[PDB]
């Protein structure tokens, strides 16, 4: 329902904390690093830097996605919005 949604926007927009649990993220980084070089170790701050940048990247993406969703007539964001945003952003997989 609309009221809780906005209430959540308001609260999480006022927030400054990392929204993903530290551990799961760290694992994702290790489980990725292993491809490029098997004997790799990341300092905790280096991992931290990645999360700060990762979540920053994502909300920024979300904002743009939101603008696309609204561009039609919707309030609900679909994959096609993330894609249209990333497209115009020049991003690629």
């Amino acid at each position: 329902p609309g009221t809780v949604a906005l209430r959540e926007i308001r609260r999480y927009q006022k927030s400054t904390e990392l929204l993903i649990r530290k551990l799961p993220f760290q694992r994702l980084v290790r489980e990725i690093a292993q491809d490029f070089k098997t004997d790799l170790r990341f300092q905790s701050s280096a991992v931290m830097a990645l999360q700060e940048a990762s979540e920053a990247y994502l909300v920024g993406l979300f904002e743009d996605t939101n603008l696309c969703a609204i561009h039609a007539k919707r309030v609900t964001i679909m994959p096609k919005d993330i894609q249209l945003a990333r497209r115009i952003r020049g991003e690629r997989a």
């Binding site: 906005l6 308001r10 927009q13 006022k14 400054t16 909300v59 904002e63 939101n66 603008l67 609204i70």
Partner: peptide, 16 residues
């Protein structure tokens, strides 16, 4: 530029 722990500027698109 990304400000670590800077968070985002409070803003809700009018249409909501």
């Amino acid at each position: 530029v990304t400000i670590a722990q800077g968070g985002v500027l409070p803003n809700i698109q009018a249409v909501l």
